[PDB]
Structure formats: C-alpha cells, structure tokens
Amino acid sequence: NNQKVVAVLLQECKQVLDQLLLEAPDVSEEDKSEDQRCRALLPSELRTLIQEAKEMKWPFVPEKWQYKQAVGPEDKTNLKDVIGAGLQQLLASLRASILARDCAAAAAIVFLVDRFLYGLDVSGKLLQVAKGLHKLQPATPIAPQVVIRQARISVNSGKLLKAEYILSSLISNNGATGTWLYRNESDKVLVQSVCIQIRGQILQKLGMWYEAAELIWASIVGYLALPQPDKKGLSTSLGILADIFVSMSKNDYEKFKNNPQINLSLLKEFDHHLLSAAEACKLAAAFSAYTPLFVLTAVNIRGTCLLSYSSSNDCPPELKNLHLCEAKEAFEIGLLTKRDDEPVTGKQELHSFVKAAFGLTTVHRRLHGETGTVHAASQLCKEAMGKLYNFSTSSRSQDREALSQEVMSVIAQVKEHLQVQSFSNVDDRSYVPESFECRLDKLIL
Numbered sequence: 328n329n330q331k332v333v334a335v336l337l338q339e340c341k342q343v344l345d346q347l348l349l350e351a352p353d354v355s356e357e358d359k360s361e362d363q364r365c366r367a368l369l370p371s372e373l374r375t376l377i378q379e380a381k382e383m384k385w386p387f388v389p390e391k392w393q394y395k396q397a398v399g400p401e402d403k404t405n406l407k408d409v410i411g412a413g414l415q416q417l418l419a420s421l422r423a424s425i426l427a428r429d430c431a432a433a434a435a436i437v438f439l440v441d442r443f444l445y446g447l448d449v450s451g452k453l454l455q456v457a458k459g460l461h462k463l464q465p466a467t468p469i470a471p472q473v474v475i476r477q478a479r480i481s482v483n484s485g486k487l488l489k490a491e492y493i494l495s496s497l498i499s500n501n502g503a504t505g506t507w508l509y510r511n512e513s514d515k516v517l518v519q520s521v522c523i524q525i526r527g528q529i530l531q532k533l534g535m536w537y538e539a540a541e542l543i544w545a546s547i548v549g550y551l552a553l554p555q556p557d558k559k560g561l562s563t564s565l566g567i568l569a570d571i572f573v574s575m576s577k578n579d580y581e582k583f584k585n586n587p588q589i590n591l592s593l594l595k596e597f598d599h600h601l602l603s604a605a606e607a608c609k610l611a612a613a614f615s616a617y618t619p620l621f622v623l624t625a626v627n628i629r630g631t632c633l634l635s636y637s638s639s640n641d642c643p644p645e646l647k648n649l650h651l652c653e654a655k656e657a658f659e660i661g662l663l664t665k666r667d668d669e670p671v672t673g674k675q676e677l678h679s680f681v682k683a684a685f686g687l688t689t690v691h692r693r694l695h696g697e698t699g700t701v702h703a704a705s706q707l708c709k710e711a712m713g714k715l716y717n718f719s720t721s722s723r724s725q726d727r728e729a730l731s732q733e734v735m736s737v738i739a740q741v742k743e744h745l746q747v748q749s750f751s752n753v754d755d756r757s758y759v760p761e762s763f764e765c766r767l768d769k770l771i772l
C-alpha cells in the first residue's frame with residue numbers, strides 16, 4: 328500500500344493493455360483460470376462488491392453508513408479498511424482480468440480501488456488503465472465516479488475548463504456517460520450533485536466566494552433530494568461551505584445571509600461568518616461520526632474559527648470564555664479521533680493531528696496565559712511539526728512509518744500534558760460527543 332509500488336503496478340497494467348492492443352485476442356485457458364482463481368481468493372465482501380460494481384448497481388461505491396439512518400454496528404465501518412487490506416490482491420485480480428480480456432470486470436476493480444488510489448495520489452495511472460480498457464473494448468462501462476475522478480485531478484492541476492467540460496457534460500445531460508446504465512433516476516441526481524459540489528470547489532479556487540457558497544448550497548439540496556440522502560456528501564459540502572465562509576468578507580457573508588432562497592438554519596441563527604463556519608463544521612463532523620479523519624478536519628476548522636472569533640473585537644467579553652471552551656472541545660475531539668496506538672497513514676491525517684495539537688495549545692495559552700504546561704506542550708508541538716515535515720519530505724517508507732509513529736507518540740504526550748478526557752457517548756463507535764447531534768432536519772428552517 329505504497330504510492331510508488333501501486334503506481335508501478337498500474338503502469339505495468341497499462342503496458343499490458345497496450346500490448347493486447349497489438350495482439351489478436353487469444354485468451355488461453357490458463358488466463359481464464361488465473362482470473363477466476365485471483366477473484367475467488369478475495370474475501371467474500373470484495374467479491375460481492377466486484378459483482379455489484381460490474382453490474383452497475385451504483386455510480387459511486389457506497390459506504391455502509393452513508394445512506395442508512397437507523398445505523399448499527401455492521402454499518403459503522405469504512406471501505407478504506409477492507410480495500411486497503413486486500414489492495415495487493417485486488418490489483419493482482421485486476422491484472423488477471425486484463426489478461427483474460429474481461430474489461431468489464433477489470434473496470435469494476437478500477438471502480439472499487441478508485442477512492443483508495445485517489446488517497447495515494449495515483450489516480451492518473453489508474454485512469455490510464457481505464458483508458459486502455461476503453462481502447463480494447465469500447466463498450467466497457469466506466470463508473471461516473473471514475474470520470475469525475477478525472478475532473479478532480481484536472482481541478483487539482485489547474486485545468487479548470489477541462490474539468491468543467493466533464494462536470495458540465497454530466498450536469499447538463501442528467502449524468503449520462505459512456506455505456507453506463509443507471510438503475511434508478513435518483514443516482515443521476517446524485518452524480519449531478521457531486522459535480523455541482525466540484526463546481527463550488529472550482530469557484531472557491533477562483534475566489535468567487537459568494538457564487539461558490541451558492542453552488543455548495545445547491546449540492547446540499549441535491550444530496551437531500553435523494554431517496555436516501557447522502558450523509559457523506561452533506562458532510563463534505565458543509566466543510567467546503569465552512570472554508571468558504573472563512574474566506575468570505577463580512578459583506579460577502581451578509582449578502583449570502585440576506586438571500587431568502589437559502590433555507591439554512593445556520594445562516595439565520597448566526598450573524599458572524601466565523602460562527603456560521605464553526606456550526607457548519609460541527610454538523611459536518613456529526614454527519615461523518617464514524618470516519619475519524621473527516622471528523623478531525625471538521626473539528627480542526629471549527630476550533631480555528633472559535634479561536635479566531637474569541638480574540639476578535641466582535642466577540643462580547645461574556646462569551647469569550649465560552650467560545651474558547653468550544654474551541655477546546657473541538658481540538659480535544661480531533662485528538663481523540665485516534666485511540667490507543669493504531670498506525671496513522673497519510674500526510675493529511677498526520678498534519679491534521681499536529682494541527683489539533685497546535686490548536687489546543689493555543690487555546691490553553693489563551694485561557695491560562697504562558698504557563699509551564701503551555702511551554703511544554705508548545706515544545707512537543709514544535710517537535711511534532713519537525714518530525715511531520717521530515718515525514719512529508721522523506722521518500723523512504725520505513726522512515727515514514729517511524730516518523731509517523733513518533734509524531735503520534737508526541738501527540739499522545741500533548742494529550743497527556745493537557746488532560747484531554749474521553750467524552751461520554753452511548754455509541755462507542757461514534758467519534759463525536761452526543762452534543763454533536765446528527766439531525767438533518769435542523770439544517771433547514
């Protein structure tokens with residue numbers, strides 16, 4: 328599960344597809360047998376997911392908690408774990424399906440690993456494999472999630488018009504793409520809603536804060552328009568909306584707030600853009616209570632907003648301590664997203680943990696001045712930042728594992744020196760306090 332290894336394997340798959348383009352179809356019984364074998368040795372859950380993806384059951388691979396309201400223990404997991412555990416074998420089955428010229432199945436595996444590989448910043452090579460599949464057998468259906476993935480890397484690269492042709496093609500034509508078949512009409516609205524969200528991100532990249540916020544609101548409406556509302560998308564859009572609220576000026580936020588078409592409770596309940604942002608982050612963390620990373624990012628932004636507002640001249644002195652305590656709670660939740668000592672992978676998650684440490688130390692400095700524990704916690708924070716940037720710059724996998732473990736050890740030490748106490752929740756699988764009520768009805772007035 329390394330970027331370089333996976334990237335090289337995807338390159339090999341692409342080379343195989345090119346060679347098959349030069350060769351005439353002659354699938355040997357060995358090829359078919361190794362295809363069936365490689366798929367059969369995968370765990371049952373992944374075989375089911377592969378068959379469902381191949382059958383075009385959904386345009387996105389869903390999470391068990393994403394569409395269910397009456398959630399339970401079997402729903403409170405994330406596919407990152409099962410996919411990450413069988414990634415090597417999923418790629419072996421991908422190569423095997425390519426050699427068997429079963430491009431529909433190979434595309435199904437591409438669909439399955441798409442999200443995890445985006446986390447590894449290797450979506451380009453994966454999309455090269457998809458293009459080779461389409462070159463061999465043009466009728467091979469490609470999931471809208473993968474097309475949108477192309478849009479995503481194009482936005483991340485600054486190719487805004489290129490991404491916008493993809494997004495606009497999906498939006499203006501009811502999500503139609505290639506030879507993909509929707510089983511119901513609502514999945515089209517879902518694809519449209521993700522594309523509209525990405526339009527919001529494009530306008531955010533351009534600093535058109537008001538219109539970006541409007542598009543994000545539209546994506547929220549679309550997520551609510553589904554038979555089962557998309558809680559994951561709502562969490563994402565609430566976070567993006569929070570960042571936009573932070574970047575907005577006060578006149579931007581006032582113009583957005585005075586638009587009656589936008590029936591957001593937080594828009595009419597708060598008058599300061601940082602407080603609206605903090606509330607939007609609270610809701611975003613509530614809506615992804617079983618995915619600790621997004622809870623951590625959301626509460627990080629929340630704590631930053633409350634820290635910034637508490638020091639503002641717009642904050643009444645009676646509430647300064649209350650908002651500082653709210654920021655303290657937020658950063659505490661963020662640090663509590665990691666329990667006991669499980670490894671932490673990814674520069675983003677690590678960076679978010681150090682961000683939570685800096686936030687909590689800053690809040691303590693605001694509450695108790697320059698105490699000794701603020702100095703010790705500050706030293707631990709700077710150490711964690713040093714090992715963090717060493718991690719980000721290192722190319723040796725073992726150094727990255729070691730620096731990650733050390734950085735998390737430091738994080739645990741700031742947790743001890745600052746007395747972060749676990750919160751009470753009747754849902755031991757949830758990463759948010761009960762105060763963070765997951766209520767979709769309160770989003771709307």
Ligand SMILES: Nc1ncnc2c1ncn2[C@@H]1O[C@H](COP(=O)(O)OP(=O)(O)O[C@@H]2O[C@H]([C@@H](O)CO)[C@@H](O)[C@H](O)[C@@H]2O)[C@@H](O)[C@H]1O
Pocket residue numbers: 387388389441442445472475521524557559560561562563566611615621622624
């Ligand atoms: N709840 C969340 N909070 C904060 N950040 C989040 C988040 N969920 C995802 N992210 C970040 O957004 C980036 C793209 O996400 P993805 O899961 O890689 O996209 P995709 O595989 O197409 O899955 C679809 O995502 C839609 C939105 O949530 C994101 O566009 C959902 O509405 C669809 O139902 C579907 O799940 C990435 O950087 C991730 O870390």
